[PDB]
């Protein structure tokens, strides 16, 4: 779920997810071109963990409820048996990290519509 999303982001890292919303070529919704840095990379692994998550049953990316904990920075994600949630919990978890551990290239905010993500 995005809520989740959005806590584990600010569990694992100082910067929380609005940071992320106008990031590089993939941060927020969409994306073209090449990850312009580490940052925009684990937006692009991230979108594309989302769109294989519609491939397992009963499982949509923004409304899919999971367990997880954050032990600031750590997160853990609880689900086992239930594999949607274990696999979109990863998803997350995946990310919020990503993000914590990549530079923040406040050169590459803004960049969408330049000649960067073509
Ligand atoms: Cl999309
Ligand atoms: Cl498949
Ligand atoms: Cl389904």
Do not use: E
């Amino acid at each position: 779920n995005l809520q989740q999303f959005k806590n584990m982001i600010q569990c694992a890292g100082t910067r929380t997810w609005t940071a992320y919303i106008n990031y590089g070529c993939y941060c927020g919704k969409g994306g073209s071109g090449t990850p312009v840095d580490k940052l925009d990379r684990c937006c692009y692994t991230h979108d594309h963990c989302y769109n294989q998550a519609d491939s397992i049953p009963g499982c949509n990316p923004n409304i899919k409820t999971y367990s997880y904990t954050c032990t600031q920075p750590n997160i853990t994600c609880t689900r086992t048996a239930d594999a949607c949630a274990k696999f979109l919990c990863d998803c997350d978890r995946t990310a919020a990290i990503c993000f914590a551990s990549a530079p923040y290239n406040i050169n590459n905010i803004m960049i969408s519509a330049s000649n960067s993500c073509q």
